[PDB]
Design a protein around this ligand. Structure first.
Ligand SMILES: [Zn+2]
Ligand SMILES: [Zn+2]
Ligand SMILES: [Zn+2]
Lengths: 448, 632, 88
């Protein structure tokens, strides 16, 4: 009776005080009134709803405040998100003492304001938060840090599109394993263990396969060095998603280096062709013509472009374009990015060691769009395969039951759209994989 | 059913992938909603060795909830078989076994499995050629100690003495896993175990020390620091005598201090460690590290300021606030952390042999010139920190900075007029300006109106809504301050009339503007009218219809009523008779819905209107008001 | 006139079976080229969504071909083990 009278006629002022206190930084009073109202029997729905909408409003305001910059600067956006998440966690610990209902309310609130927000709204794509998270993780691990990794792993659980982050992280790991620029092995092992505990074996299978491949590559390199500067990192075709490289011109200065490796591979492992990738291979240049010895971290492409200037009276874009046989846009962007550093002798530098390796800044958007599209047809093919193979045991079933089973099976992965599933079913029928029975409508019978 | 399970086993056992998938889906659905158990356990064990990934995933996911209904006789058998396969050669089988063990322990709340696994791992954790086995075993033990940790009547000493030699492993990763396992163990922890652990640590301290021992001590203290009170008196002297070393090893030593204060509050050893950290803040000689050693000292200062409350004169009378204030010209992290420490101290200064007011007042000029020197930086973070510092210094007590407004105004003007400024920076600058204008007397803001009106007016119109609302608040506060009716003033504000009115009426229109900005504009208009409207005579008898048409809207009904109430209760006469005829029925029509705040507001508005203005009153409005009284 | 020397290369290799890159066993055609039955009837996005699959044994085959081979056996033609799927 006391709680009823104190609350039933005081809902408006209590809710206003809740909103005002939550807007400001005052957690002790929030916990005080949470203790005050916790004695109510089944009357907390309004308070839960009010906190949920306020958390949504705070997320929207924080995300929209840093507009036009969080799109290209994921670092500060992820830092702000982590700060907000840890502030809410501390508030919950201090006030709500880890109430299960309130914890669930916070969880779905974070899910809501992470899946969609002001930044997501203008981009017309609700798949950007995993991209920012993966970029932040890669930059953090690209050369004390266990707490931030644990918090990131915890907050990732709210993201429904987990396969997006899994594929992104796998691609970033595959790219990063080429160049010796990873962090300490302890941090990598801890992250692998955390992903193994959280994510299923499907994601970690590729990671373990790549670890085994790099291990055997290192063993083979060590054995060759024992039998015998140069290095080689052999990778499998089905374990490293890499787009096929275009035509390229082999430099004549180190042709024997590739000839000997090819001969050794043919002698040892015959009947297996190799396709070296001339895109990800760095090194240092020993300059002597300059005023002082200088070193540049050069990738294969612009290193070959620079080498194309040795012993040539005249240089033209067309001749190197038709000799190297590379796309014009990539060539132009590389030339612009190398000319921006005032490199293309006589110019000095502040430090003896520079590192000209810089982000592409132009192909990132194209690569991201390509990866998103690839994930799209991956989802389409996966759902098509699931639909066609479900009917192997189930002879005949209704359309609604099949749709429900498909939704339930991949519920932890993603929520496919109804029109996409309908189109997949229709094209499967058109591909002679189904028969339309005339006895019942919206019914199909399995066919070989 | 017996026939159903027999058919499922027969159809599934046909060397098929899709059929196995559907059978696994079926049995998981059945589980969710004597010989059969043996058969399914055997077939799951067979599937555990299958090369397929999806089938193995399905089996390992099924293994979790299967423990609920399976018998308790073969659980030891399957655990032993999994442990035996854990020592295999193929890494994929190793990963599968680890996933299975983690899954079953996760779904576990029969209890012999924990004893068996810990007994086997006691021998497994011992020295072995492979290091991967040790890492996996340490991860498993950490999982046990995080989840299990119940009775363990005669198992803690064995695991303890077996894990002790593992602390000296050359690999840093193995050392970290052992430290994490020990921390989990002490957190889960018994009456004497920590005694032998601390005795061994102290004995090992008097040897060739390494970061491992200090890191382990810090970890066990952080996990459980409420049971170390009699050992400290030999812990601090060791840290002090080991701090005077040339090589860079003081990091963990300084990290120990803040967690020590956080865990154990009552201890009479504060002055020595405080002096140690005060001296250690002075080191000033990525290859360079000296820009990071002060982070631990700053965290130490944060912790000691937060935990201590009853010895404010001891902190204040010393050179500690002085040394904190002068130590500002450092890196971004150091500057941010000292600013955080000072903000925490000022927040603590509020009450919960001179009083702290005297020393605060004497240090105010020092803080002022330090902040003014710190203003000359292009970094946004420093500007936000300085504005938060000013806001805290003004909020703590009223009339604090009454002698530095002329020198602090240009900084605010520059931070508001610069093109390179974030939204948060402008918001906090406007909030600081508003709070300064509110707390301080109007007498120290008259000469600065010529400098404060243009930037505020310019900032009123911005695409953002938070910035616009804060600018409207600042405008209303400035309007109230410039013309205080409480005490007579001698100043001419005629040029600012139109300048404020243009922006105030511009923001009063809909213009698809958010509710908060519209309400702030309505409040600004109400205050401006109430305290200044005699100058506005041309637009007075035609702009009042905006309030009348906005009264119908539910989104803006309280703010307009409050503005009307403020306008009516103004000592200076405001012409409202032509609007009174068409306004009273509008307010009367709202006396039907259940809204206490709106009811009180509109009652106050009508009361003040009839009190101040009663020359012209018809009978229809009086009858309407009277008829609306019984529902109220 | 201007010359310089490179110290290290650190190249990357991608190994694959000669038979797989030569042609796919199921349909006697170039693996790069699209299969025949898909191009025989082009009326939807099948001609574009068709691609080459992958497995544990590092063997590349068309999705339609391997799908058709399924339910006749569960083996890849030239390597004699259970077919596995890892990436598209
Ligand atoms: Zn095809
Ligand atoms: Zn084919
Ligand atoms: Zn094969």
């Amino acid at each position: 009776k006391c709680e009823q009278v104190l609350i039933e006629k005081h809902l408006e002022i209590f809710h206003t005080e809740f909103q005002n206190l939550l807007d400001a930084d005052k957690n002790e009073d929030l916990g005080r009134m949470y203790n005050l109202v916790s004695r109510i029997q089944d009357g907390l729905g309004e308070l839960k709803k009010l906190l949920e909408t306020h958390i949504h409003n705070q997320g929207l305001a924080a995300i929209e405040k840093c507009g036009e910059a969080a799109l290209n600067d994921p670092k500060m956006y992820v830092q702000t998100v982590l700060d907000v998440h840890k502030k809410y966690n501390a508030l919950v610990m201090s006030a709500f003492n880890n109430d299960a209902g309130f914890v669930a309310a916070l969880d779905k609130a974070c899910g809501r304001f992470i899946n969609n927000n002001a930044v997501t709204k203008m981009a017309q794509s609700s798949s950007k938060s995993p991209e920012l998270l993966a970029r932040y993780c890669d930059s953090l691990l690209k050369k004390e840090l266990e707490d931030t990794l644990n918090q990131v792993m915890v907050v990732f659980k709210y993201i429904e599109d987990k396969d997006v982050f899994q594929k992104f992280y796998a691609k970033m790991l595959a790219k990063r394993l080429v160049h010796q620029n990873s962090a300490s092995d302890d941090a990598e092992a801890s992250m692998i263990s955390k992903l193994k505990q959280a994510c299923g074996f499907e994601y970690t299978s590729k990671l373990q396969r790549m670890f085994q491949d790099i291990g055997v590559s290192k063993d083979l390199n060590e054995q060759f060095k024992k039998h015998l500067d140069f290095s080689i990192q052999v990778l499998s075709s089905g374990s490293w998603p890499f787009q096929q490289s275009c035509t390229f011109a082999l430099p004549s200065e180190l042709e024997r280096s590739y000839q000997r490796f090819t001969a050794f591979y043919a002698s040892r492992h015959s009947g297996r062709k190799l396709t070296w990738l001339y895109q990800l291979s760095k090194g240092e240049l020993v300059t002597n013509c300059f005023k002082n010895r200088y070193t540049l971290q050069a990738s294969t492409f612009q290193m070959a472009i620079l080498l194309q200037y040795n012993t040539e009276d005249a240089y033209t874009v067309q001749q190197l374009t038709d000799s190297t046989q590379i796309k014009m846009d990539i060539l132009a962007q590389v030339l612009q990015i190398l000319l921006k550093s005032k490199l293309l002798l006589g110019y000095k530098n502040k430090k003896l060691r520079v590192n000209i390796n810089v982000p592409m800044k132009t192909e990132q958007k194209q690569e991201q769009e390509t990866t998103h599209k690839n994930i799209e047809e991956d989802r389409k093919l996966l759902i098509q395969a699931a639909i066609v193979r479900i009917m192997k045991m189930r002879k005949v079933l209704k359309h609604q039951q099949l749709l429900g089973e498909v939704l339930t099976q991949l519920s932890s992965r993603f929520k496919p759209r109804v029109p996409v599933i309908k189109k997949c079913i229709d094209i499967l029928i058109e591909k002679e994989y189904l028969e339309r029975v005339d006895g019942e409508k919206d019914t199909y019978s399995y066919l070989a | 059913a017996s026939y159903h399970i027999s058919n499922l086993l027969e159809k599934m056992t046909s060397s098929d992938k899709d059929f196995r998938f559907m059978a696994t889906n079926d049995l998981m659905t059945e589980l969710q909603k004597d010989d059969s158990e043996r058969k399914v356990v055997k077939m799951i064990l067979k599937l555990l060795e299958d090369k397929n990934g999806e089938v193995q995933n399905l089996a390992v996911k099924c293994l979790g909830p299967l423990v609920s209904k399976v018998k308790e006789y073969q659980v030891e058998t399957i655990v032993d078989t999994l442990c035996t396969n854990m020592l295999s050669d193929k890494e994929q089988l190793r990963d599968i076994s680890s996933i299975g063990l983690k899954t079953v322990i996760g779904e576990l709340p029969a209890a012999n499995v924990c004893k068996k696994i810990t007994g086997r791992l006691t021998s497994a954790i011992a020295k072995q050629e492979d290091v991967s086995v040790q890492l996996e075993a340490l991860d498993i033990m950490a999982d046990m100690l995080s989840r299990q940790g119940g009775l363990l009547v005669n198992f803690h000493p064995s695991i303890l003495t077996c894990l002790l030699p593992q602390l000296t492993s050359p690999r840093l990763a193995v050392r970290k896993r052992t430290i994490i396992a020990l921390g989990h163990l002490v957190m889960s922890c018994f009456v004497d175990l920590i005694e032998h652990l601390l005795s061994e640590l102290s004995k090992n301290d008097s040897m060739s020390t390494t970061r491992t021992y200090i890191q382990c001590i810090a970890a066990i203290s952080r996990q459980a620091g409420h049971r170390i009170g009699e050992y400290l008196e030999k812990i601090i002297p060791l840290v002090v005598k080991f701090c005077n070393v040339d090589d860079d090893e003081l990091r963990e030593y300084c990290i120990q201090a803040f967690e020590s204060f956080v865990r154990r509050c009552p201890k009479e050893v504060y002055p020595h460690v405080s002096t140690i950290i005060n001296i250690c803040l002075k080191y000033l000689t990525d290859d360079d590290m000296s820009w990071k050693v002060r982070r631990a000292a700053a965290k130490c200062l944060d912790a000691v300021v937060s935990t201590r409350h009853e010895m404010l004169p001891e902190f204040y009378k010393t050179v500690s606030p002085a040394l904190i204030s002068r130590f500002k010209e450092r890196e971004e992290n150091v500057k941010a952390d000292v600013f955080h420490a000072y903000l925490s101290l000022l927040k603590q200064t509020r009450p919960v042999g001179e009083t702290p007011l005297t020393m605060l007042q004497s240090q105010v000029p020092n803080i002022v010139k330090a902040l003014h020197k710190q203003m000359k930086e292009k970094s946004v973070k420093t500007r936000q920190c300085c504005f938060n510092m000013l806001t805290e210094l003004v909020n703590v007590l009223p009339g604090a900075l009454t002698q530095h407004i002329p020198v602090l105004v240009p900084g605010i003007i520059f931070s508001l007029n610069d093109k390179s400024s974030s939204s948060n920076l402008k918001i906090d600058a406007l909030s600081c300006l508003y709070v300064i204008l509110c707390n301080h007397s109007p007498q120290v803001f008259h000469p600065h109106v010529q400098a404060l009106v243009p930037p505020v007016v310019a900032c009123v119109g911005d695409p953002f809504y938070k910035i616009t609302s804060e600018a409207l608040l600042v405008t209303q506060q400035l309007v109230k301050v410039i013309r205080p009716l409480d005490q007579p003033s001698s100043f001419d504000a005629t040029p600012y009339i139109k300048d404020l009115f243009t922006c105030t009426i511009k923001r009063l229109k809909a213009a698809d503007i958010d509710q908060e900005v519209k309400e702030r504009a309505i409040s600004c208009m109400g205050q401006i009218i109430c305290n200044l409207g005699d100058n506005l005579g041309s637009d007075l008898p035609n702009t009042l219809q905006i309030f009348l048409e906005r009264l119908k809207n539910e989104i803006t009904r309280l703010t307009t009523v409050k503005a009307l109430t403020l306008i009516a209760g103004s000592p200076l006469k405001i012409d409202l008779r032509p609007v009174l005829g068409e306004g009273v029925p509008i307010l009367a029509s709202f006396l039907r819905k259940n809204q206490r705040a709106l009811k009180l507001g509109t009652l106050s508005a009508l009361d003040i209107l009839i009190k101040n203005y009663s020359d012209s009153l018809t009978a229809a409005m009086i009858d309407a008001v009277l008829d609306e009284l019984p529902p109220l | 006139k201007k010359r310089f020397e490179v110290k290290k290369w650190n190249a990357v290799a991608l190994w694959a079976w000669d038979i797989v890159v030569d042609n796919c066993a199921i349909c006697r055609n170039h693996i790069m080229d699209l299969c025949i039955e898909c191009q025989a009837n082009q009326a939807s996005a099948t001609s574009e969504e068709c691609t080459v699959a992958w497995g544990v044994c590092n063997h590349a085959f068309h999705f339609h071909c391997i799908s058709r081979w399924l339910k006749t056996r569960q083996v890849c033609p030239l390597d004699n083990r259970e077919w596995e799927f890892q990436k598209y």
